[PDB]
Design a protein around this ligand. Sequence first.
Ligand SMILES: O=C1N[C@H](c2c(CNCCCCCCNCc3[nH]c4ccccc4c3[C@H]3NC(=O)c4ccc(O)cc43)[nH]c3ccccc23)c2cc(O)ccc21
Ligand SMILES: Nc1nc2c(ncn2[C@@H]2O[C@H](COP(=O)(O)OP(=O)(O)CP(=O)(O)O)[C@@H](O)[C@H]2O)c(=O)[nH]1
Ligand SMILES: Nc1nc2c(ncn2[C@@H]2O[C@H](COP(=O)(O)OP(=O)(O)CP(=O)(O)O)[C@@H](O)[C@H]2O)c(=O)[nH]1
Ligand SMILES: [Mg+2]
Ligand SMILES: [Mg+2]
Lengths: 169, 167
Amino acid sequence: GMTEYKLVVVGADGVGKSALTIQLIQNHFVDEYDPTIEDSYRKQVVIDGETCLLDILDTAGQEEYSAMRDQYMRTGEGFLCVFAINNTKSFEDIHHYREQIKRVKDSEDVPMVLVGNKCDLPSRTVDTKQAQDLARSYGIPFIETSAKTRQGVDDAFYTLVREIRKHKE
Amino acid sequence: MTEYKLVVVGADGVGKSALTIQLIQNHFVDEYDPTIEDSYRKQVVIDGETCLLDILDTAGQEEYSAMRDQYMRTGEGFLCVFAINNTKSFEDIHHYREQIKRVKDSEDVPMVLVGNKCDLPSRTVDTKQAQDLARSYGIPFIETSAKTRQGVDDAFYTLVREIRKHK
Ligand SMILES: O=C1N[C@H](c2c(CNCCCCCCNCc3[nH]c4ccccc4c3[C@H]3NC(=O)c4ccc(O)cc43)[nH]c3ccccc23)c2cc(O)ccc21
Ligand SMILES: Nc1nc2c(ncn2[C@@H]2O[C@H](COP(=O)(O)OP(=O)(O)CP(=O)(O)O)[C@@H](O)[C@H]2O)c(=O)[nH]1
Ligand SMILES: Nc1nc2c(ncn2[C@@H]2O[C@H](COP(=O)(O)OP(=O)(O)CP(=O)(O)O)[C@@H](O)[C@H]2O)c(=O)[nH]1
Ligand SMILES: [Mg+2]
Ligand SMILES: [Mg+2]
């Protein structure tokens, strides 16, 4: 009936990790840029008729983290790997997050969703096709999101829960 | 690429148009403008599949239901919408469900029960009562808000998944 899920939101500086989480939890867009150290949020949601208690870890994008990172990558059940569609460097950084999660988990089969955030902006530098091809090579879903409009936000989190559910079964 | 014909039904002022406009245009319509009949196309990716949604936004008023049996036969899936602060709109769900089943000549019709206006603290219809009704119908129940966009994609995507299973 009731199941807890530990979700981890990872990605480079300013991709919108906090804004995506705050949209899901508080139903509003944060226009401010306030760097995260580490925050966690709970949310009880119904996904495919099942009562899920989400425990979401919102991580720091700030580079030079071999600190606290391995522990949450070990504890986390599923990962949202976020890049911003107008930030090519954040997309190139996905390889590093994916590889480190796989290394810490000691598995090639880790519940994960590739998230292309800021899809409300007409300043795209990363094509949907290139990100779709990367997710296909990883064997993971790819979802374009906007923390501003809330487009794809529920889809990204719910898809990740569905991926965790499949892994356990 | 797959086309999906979706029909949004429900009583007067439940937010059928606002839910659709939020999905198609990513904005909330504050104004109340009664619908006669409108349709919208939207290309979306659902579970890796490119879907072309053809959404029919219907009238909540009886006066504009001349196409009702025809769109209930043509429609592949139905969003049956009530407003959580309108008990009469929840009681009206029985009529929409029964007419869809009658026109389709089947008890197995892709359908999602939608409890809209969940952003309002003026609820008159409990989540449990609506969950129990959806359970008795054997259909999913999703609470939505066209204002915040909470549950909107979940409601439309769930309906596409229900159609996909039926097919
Ligand atoms: O399933 C049920 N849960 C309910 C329940 C609760 C309430 N729980 C509320 C969550 C509170 C988490 C708050 C810290 N959670 C913070 C958090 N969220 C994360 C998400 C991903 C990864 C790590 C974390 C972490 C951190 N935890 C780590 O180990 C860690 C490592 C490195 C890091 O850097 C960060 C972290 N308490 C219970 C005690 C006994 C039995 C049941 C329960 C319950 C009641 C019930 O009637 C029936 C069923 C249930
Ligand atoms: N237009 C637009 N802006 C966004 C979106 N998501 C986040 N932003 C903006 O980007 C900036 C950074 O967002 P934030 O959510 O703090 O990113 P972050 O990845 O958590 C930053 P850190 O890694 O230091 O914790 C903010 O000004 C925020 O308003 C989006 O989907 N669209
Ligand atoms: N607070 C809140 N208001 C809503 C929501 N959805 C619709 N409304 C409001 O309800 C009113 C009617 O919405 P509308 O989308 O026209 O409803 P409708 O069911 O299409 C009306 P008709 O049946 O005549 O076509 C509008 O004022 C609109 O702003 C919601 O989720 N939350
Ligand atoms: Mg942050
Ligand atoms: Mg209308």
